[PDB]
Specification:
- Chains A, B, C: Belongs to the IlvD/Edd family.
- Chains A, B, C: Pfam families: ILV_EDD_C (PF24877), ILVD_EDD_N (PF00920).
- Chains A, B, C: This is Dihydroxyacid dehydratase/phosphogluconate dehydratase.
- This is part of a larger assembly, with 3 copies of chain A.
- By secondary structure, chain A is of the alpha/beta class.
- The first copy, chain A, has a domain of 166 residues: IlvD/EDD C-terminal domain-like (Glucose Oxidase, domain 1, 3-Layer(bba) Sandwich).
- Helix content of chain A is 32%, strand content 12%.
- In chain A, the strands form 3 sheets. An 8-stranded mixed beta sheet of chain A has the order 7-8-12-11-10-9-13-14.
- In chain A, helix 18 links the parallel strand 10 and strand 11.
- In chain A, helix 9 packs antiparallel against helix 11 and helix 11 runs antiparallel to helix 12.
- The longest helix of chain A has 20 residues.
- Chain A starts with 9 loop residues before the first helix and ends in a 26-residue tail after the last helix.
- At the A-B interface, helix 2, strand 1, strand 2, helix 4 and helix 6 of A face helix 2, strand 1, strand 2, helix 4 and helix 7 of B.
Chain lengths: 575, 575, 575
Amino acid sequence: AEWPRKLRSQEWYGGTSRDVIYHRGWLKNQGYPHDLFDGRPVIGILNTWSDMTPCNGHLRELAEKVKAGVWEAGGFPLEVPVFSASENTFRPTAMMYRNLAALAVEEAIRGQPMDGCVLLVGCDKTTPSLLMGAASCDLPSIVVTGGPMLNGYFRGERVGSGTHLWKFSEMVKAGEMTQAEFLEAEASMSRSSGTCNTMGTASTMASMAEALGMALSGNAAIPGVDSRRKVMAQLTGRRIVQMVKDDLKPSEIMTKQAFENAIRTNAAIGGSTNAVIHLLAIAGRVGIDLSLDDWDRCGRDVPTIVNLMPSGKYLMEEFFYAGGLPVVLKRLGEAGLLHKDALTVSGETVWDEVKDVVNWNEDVILPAEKALTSSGGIVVLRGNLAPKGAVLKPSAASPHLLVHKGRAVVFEDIDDYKAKINDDNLDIDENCIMVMKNCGPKGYPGMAEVGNMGLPPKVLKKGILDMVRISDARMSGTAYGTVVLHTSPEAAVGGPLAVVKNGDMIELDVPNRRLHLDISDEELARRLAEWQPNHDLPTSGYAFLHQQHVEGADTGADLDFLKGCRGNAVGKDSH
Amino acid sequence: AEWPRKLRSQEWYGGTSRDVIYHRGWLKNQGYPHDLFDGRPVIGILNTWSDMTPCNGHLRELAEKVKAGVWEAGGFPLEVPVFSASENTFRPTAMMYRNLAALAVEEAIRGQPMDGCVLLVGCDKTTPSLLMGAASCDLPSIVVTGGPMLNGYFRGERVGSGTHLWKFSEMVKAGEMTQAEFLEAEASMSRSSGTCNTMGTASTMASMAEALGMALSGNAAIPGVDSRRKVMAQLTGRRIVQMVKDDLKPSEIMTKQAFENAIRTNAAIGGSTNAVIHLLAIAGRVGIDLSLDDWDRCGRDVPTIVNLMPSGKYLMEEFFYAGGLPVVLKRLGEAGLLHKDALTVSGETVWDEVKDVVNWNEDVILPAEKALTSSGGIVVLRGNLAPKGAVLKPSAASPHLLVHKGRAVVFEDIDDYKAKINDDNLDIDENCIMVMKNCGPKGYPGMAEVGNMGLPPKVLKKGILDMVRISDARMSGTAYGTVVLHTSPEAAVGGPLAVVKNGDMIELDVPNRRLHLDISDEELARRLAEWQPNHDLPTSGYAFLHQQHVEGADTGADLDFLKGCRGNAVGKDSH
Amino acid sequence: AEWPRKLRSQEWYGGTSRDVIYHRGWLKNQGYPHDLFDGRPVIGILNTWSDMTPCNGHLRELAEKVKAGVWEAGGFPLEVPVFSASENTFRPTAMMYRNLAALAVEEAIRGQPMDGCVLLVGCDKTTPSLLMGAASCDLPSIVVTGGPMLNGYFRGERVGSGTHLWKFSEMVKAGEMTQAEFLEAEASMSRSSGTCNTMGTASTMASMAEALGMALSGNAAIPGVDSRRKVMAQLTGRRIVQMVKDDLKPSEIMTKQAFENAIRTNAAIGGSTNAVIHLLAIAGRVGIDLSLDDWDRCGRDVPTIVNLMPSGKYLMEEFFYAGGLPVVLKRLGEAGLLHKDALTVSGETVWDEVKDVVNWNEDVILPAEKALTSSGGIVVLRGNLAPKGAVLKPSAASPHLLVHKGRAVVFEDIDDYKAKINDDNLDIDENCIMVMKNCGPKGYPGMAEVGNMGLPPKVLKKGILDMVRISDARMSGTAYGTVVLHTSPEAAVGGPLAVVKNGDMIELDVPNRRLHLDISDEELARRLAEWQPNHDLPTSGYAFLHQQHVEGADTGADLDFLKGCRGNAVGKDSH
């Protein structure tokens, strides 16, 4: 657009109206000079900091750096704290509140006088929610990631916050670790401010925001306690004042090329399984028809070149010294797998920003021939047990179980699981297939991170660490093993997964992308008619709003009345 | 109950197991000693501070005082920012987002491991929302009002925040003031951190939070920049620890009698018309049968003894030095208009706290004989034109217009107001009735503060600043005049207000509580079945959800699915 | 003593009377409840934080943890910023202002109503100064070291803060590196908040503060950005309350034995040559007869078992994960080189705290056989050239140059160095001795870090990075080489170092402790009585006061009128 011009904040603060004197003089009570209401870009800094949100604990001092950058560039920074959904404190799960934060963030952008937004994000659900709310207003926006934690060291051993949680949870069931060790290692597993140090959900979405071009280059892997995270914060504050002037909207950046670049960036790093839902949700808010097919198309024939847990061996620290994500984006461009013309928040193309970077560690960002998997893209398993969709993370999955077929052990609820697994009075062998239902959106409710079902000790005691597992739930970004997620439609909405009976047989074949229940179509309609809903239904509250209006994980698990871009039209005067 | 006991927080941080090590160890990365997770109460400090809400600017500093007060009593203080909506920024109105805040404040209390809540409020819409949320969970809660601003002096003369905005707006249209003299005062009205220095919407709801017992005694009047507000916050942090141990829930405090004292106290202080809605809406979250009839009942024959603007002369400073609210409540106990037995968050009763207080200024807290107005309680006007209800502020109205009967001059919407009222040609005089429609919870939308309609400049120049104004909207607590408000139900829902037309006559009676449109009920009932809404409604978003599940002023303008205390019952585990 | 009792703070805030109401009521304006002045200990939190001292940048955040730790133990925390001098900013040197800080830190403890002191230190000159001040008052005190930086990685290779600055400076003069490759590393060396990540001047003095017992156990090694530094600070705030009640003064802790463990521990860690001066200077403020002879005595035949730079290989991170200082002190107790009886601020003994600790990395905390150097204690070299003293760092020197004897090449002042050393023509080879004068406490002035003289580029290009360097100055704890330092007394005070001239030969012997200039004592004693200072001295200011009352390295470079504990005896009342 053409600068100078009248910005949307001048409806509040510009003029000599009675309503303007009401809005301007009220903000002046905080000690702002008169010329800050002259039309210069007002920048809202959306901070998800909270003491109940420890992966955002350092985000408050980062807001100070953003403000300085906005001051230097001639803007007007204002800090706006928003709903902070974190999976390490919320219950039943932080996922049921992701759209609530997206709803709250949206109304906090449209109703308050801000011309541009800085998204201070960090934890799992912080990044997508603020991207859902900001994309629905289409104001110039930019992302500042909090950063990962430092490497957890326990007795001279590298420990990943998240992956080593499950790994030690089995070594006490299989009989190789005292719960004291599982407790003495608690204080050393998480020892800095930031999110997980594995390629978990927060580390994945931090990379997704950069591959989408919504964050400055290199924002993904800078540790939260690193100095260059504070430099990134102040330079982001400088630029958002320009993005408001040049009118650089999320619609102009998050294009179909950007969403595709993110899907391929997800395979190269071993991205979390949750990156599918969140990218599908953000797409619906912008206007891009991203189908779940686009994940299995762009994800295939793309190797995982990043050697980080859970799929690998190192943590987010070594990923940053090797060069970070810009090295991964160059390696995609070197293989003809990158939209080199995708515009970024910097005004440059994604290629122009990463074409001249160096890989400082080939043991971390591996060469292509030494990748963890020749095609580690998240696969989609269309079939009859999951007609709408089902996903699997191949990089962490066992190679021989990807083609497997066994006897179904069934759990109706998570309490069914959490009662029979520990009981040594069940027919369960290493070649079985655990199946849980009623854990999707409406099921759990909210869809929880319980897809990584723990194996029984009688299987773990032998020395077996992976079994095929199917659920309509999710799992942590730090999880591993052969696990099928997003089994849509879920059980608690009338899906074939709800009528899975014990003893039955399931076929798993990743190559042809088929998860099939070898049962005649005639026996479905009789199974699918004696099914009566079982999940806990809420009578009122926000759970009622979620329940009646949440969509399916094959479409982003959004809220049906929230999908799309509503715009940032300045509302009518408050007086 | 029995202390010691296991609180709801220990469901997160209690003992061993994998889920707890994921919860406790993830929070330890913010530098917390091990013993803080033993079982001592975890106190969530809900802070509505925001750079965008300047009536709350000093609350970060207040939060650190509450933190110190929780460390001293052996607690665990944690700050959790919540959604902040204030009338001085949000558009179209901050009332449309009141339920959104109550929605988020509810779900942040239930999902997160807080044993007790501290409600850091200040602005107009922050006191009810955090009560509509904390009561819907009924967890131990306490209020720390931010504080009002200092008195604004303009050229040596006293000036009220907001009150002198509607007073200088009309003085400009009457030729008695220049817009340039209005601009010069813009920076001298609001000169400290806090809310309006009158008995406005934010000063009223701070008083109710004390007459309801939901805050400490002597809490609604201390200026936000006074040092004794920081003492109030630090001691309010000590009490909530013992409150959690003793399980001092809002249901044990906000009784029908606790509300009864507030409705009467709203008369004695000259409170706003928005305390009606907010007390009606808050009542549902506690499960109490409040009503517009309970307001007229308990409010009738109670005089306003506080001489603050807009009803009187002085500002909130003089009120504080005069003694504050403890004098006004003691004035109602020595007069037999107060339930002295009601319990407060302090562990003592209302009378036990307001017993030995002195009135250090009879010019401010006036005695019975010199009282401002005979019957100062907010009145409720039943009638054919408002069968669901309508309210009026008696202490600020003109006594010669309470029983007026004149021509009706109609404005279809707010745009039909702000286009004709400043025309030289308009069939309106000093005796006409100003009626405006489509300004309710579904019409504006959000029920805005546009009730105090500015008179025609041709009527102001004669020398009169009061005409009967009838609207279905709200108006600020700083507003004045013979304006009947909350005309439930609004126009776009088929209320009989929608059928009024130019030339008609309206009866207004206050001691009889009769708001009457005298036409043939035939002519009425025809216009009802013949009227149609204008269509053009939102098809998605929160503005869509509001248009569907919201209600009317007679109830509390709440969302229908949100009433009722849903309890602090933890859901199920996250993993 | 007997708790409860009246502490020195009650002389200010005790009881009634006019002086007290002036003291107590004047502090209440910051929002403090009444009961905090009853008698509970007032804890002054001396914070050396400054935007100018980046090795202390995170101390404000640390101060708030100490505050929380004092509120919990029923104390009264108050933050008092003090003078901060760090080598990375001050000119001509931060040592010239060390006594100035100790002067101000002393007078802020005596004059102000603090019962106990918390010493928030971090940078090089902040640990001794706040000990030289807190001991001169001998009020209950405790140390909270800020913490070292994270390991800096440059192109995948490890890099030491400061150590790789003297290593890349010489590699540039030897043609083995470019100044542009030196500039690129500037931002990858220091990337977190803290001091040098080597065993530098600030990491050494943090270790001494723990071997002296003046800090909690496991306090010198935690990285400043590690979460467990915030736990260390919060618990250090609880202890000082009980420390004040029990009257646990530094005189009861910093015994001759407590110093004796530190002097030996300085060997085991590979400590700096500046721990000598700072322990010598600190000793006077406690009233203990330390000496350069006590250093050679207790340091002789103690090996450096810590493999950190500049003496070894790794950085301070590996030291922390290896176990830290508790392993190094336990290694001296199981070897019979430690007074296990010494008391610490924890209420337990050194052995009681370092008893059950594990060495999680024998490659870092090396065993006796693989130890770095045989006798690693700092040596003291008596002789005709240095009758008052001279020190050497054995673990960093070249073993083939400890017994060198070659030609002396003299530089009159530092300007006479930085003008000839980079000339193609200079009569110096690999066997000459580099001697530089006028760089002591009165010569430079301030005794700067210029001992590690950069070799001539014509000698570096042969492939040798070590030549015998003799100077009366200091050098950083990150420095390396066969450099004899602290050549007391300096030149401008008539030390025999002032008479050395080109062509002369110097004997250096370390196992015999002989630094010898072999000329006719006639030729010596003549040059003494014939030499004159250059005049041109300051005529006013603090640089004048320094030139008069300062001393030499053999004593502690203190101001003469400053030695001795003057007690916490309150003066007389202010009114």
